[PDB]
Design a binder for this molecule. Structure first.
Ligand SMILES: CCc1nc2ccccc2nc1N1CCN(S(=O)(=O)c2ccc(C)cc2)CC1
Ligand SMILES: [Mg+2]
Ligand SMILES: [Zn+2]
Length: 314
């Protein structure tokens, strides 16, 4: 380094600050987009450039060539966290800023394009090692594996204490991307917000709020402009339909969301998802962190586009 400031072309320099930024189809630019975000979010001092670059490149290598849960999803989820962090400057600790972009880049490490349910029904060894949040315990394990490679300890300057804290932020942040855990977490956050007991000084409360940020970042395809949201849905369903086919091979009728013979039902399925998951998620997140409101707004725009799909207006 250390007078070596990463810079993006003008359109990307400006649009990367917005919630609805799409990182584009140039895979070789995604590392530099991430380093740019870390440097602006955390500092040019938070990591050794050489270590960070070696970390990024091994993380990339440990994402698979699957239609949705790939390297592009990793960096997209990290970008949504960057936009939240940058819009809420003063609310987050030095360790939080360090851990959370890394947790986002690593949150689906070594994903095979299959749900926790499918692993359990297949009887995958990972389902015997990790009885709940199966893939999420695996993603965290792969994150620690990569951090333990020679020349890959991006946290090397931290004390023993701070290193355990940062790895505990990452572990909780990654486990929270289990959507099965989201529903309870958001209910509690909503009760706490409304009875005015929510306290960002209570670590157990910060944990919940970081969990909800992680869901919000993970679901951020619903917060893009319609043509991005619509095209991303295709990749999401390409994975679901493969899992459906694999369910059928075990002699199990999949749920309709995963059945490629039931493609006509996707628009109504999207409606349910925006109503039951996405809108509540961004609504509670906006109550706790008002500057995240553009995510709710974009989500509501996309619900309205799915309503139009159903009404054959598109
Ligand atoms: C409507 C579908 C949907 N659309 C999305 C659109 C945009 C972004 C994210 C999206 N996520 C979606 N999924 C995420 C996965 N879950 S799950 O509950 O973990 C689940 C897992 C396995 C099985 C067998 C049943 C349920 C369901 C919802
Ligand atoms: Mg995941
Ligand atoms: Zn994810």
């Amino acid at each position: 380094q250390g007078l070596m400031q990463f810079t993006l072309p003008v359109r990307l320099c400006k649009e990367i600050e917005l919630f609805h930024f799409d990182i584009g189809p140039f895979e070789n630019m995604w590392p530099g987009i991430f380093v740019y975000m870390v440097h602006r979010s955390c500092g040019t001092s938070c990591f050794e450039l050489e270590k960070l670059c070696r970390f990024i490149m091994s993380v990339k290598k440990n994402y698979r060539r699957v239609p949705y849960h790939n390297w592009k999803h990793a960096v997209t989820v990290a970008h949504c966290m960057y936009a939240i962090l940058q819009n809420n400057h003063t609310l987050f600790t030095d360790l939080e800023r360090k851990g959370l972009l890394i947790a986002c880049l690593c949150h689906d490490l070594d994903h095979r394009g299959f749900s926790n349910s499918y692993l359990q029904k297949f009887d995958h060894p990972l389902a015997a090692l990790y009885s709940t949040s199966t893939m999420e315990q695996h993603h965290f394990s792969q994150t620690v594996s990569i951090l333990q490679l020679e020349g890959h300890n991006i946290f090397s300057t931290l004390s023993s204490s701070e290193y355990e804290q940062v790895l505990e932020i990452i572990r909780k942040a990654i486990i929270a991307t289990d959507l099965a855990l989201y529903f309870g977490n958001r209910k509690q956050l909503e009760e706490m917000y409304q009875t005015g007991s929510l306290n960002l000084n209570n670590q157990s409360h910060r944990d919940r709020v970081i969990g909800l940020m992680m869901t919000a970042c993970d679901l951020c395809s619903v917060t893009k402009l319609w043509p991005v949201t619509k095209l991303t849905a295709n990749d999401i369903y390409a994975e679901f339909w493969a899992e459906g086919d694999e369910m059928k091979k075990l002699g199990i009728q999949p749920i309709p969301m995963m059945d490629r013979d039931k493609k006509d039902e996707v628009p109504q399925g999207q409606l349910g998802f925006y109503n039951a998951v996405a809108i509540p998620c961004y609504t509670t997140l906006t109550q706790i962190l008002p500057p995240t409101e553009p995510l709710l707004k974009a989500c509501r725009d996309n619900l309205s586009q799915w309503e139009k799909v159903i009404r054959g207006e598109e």
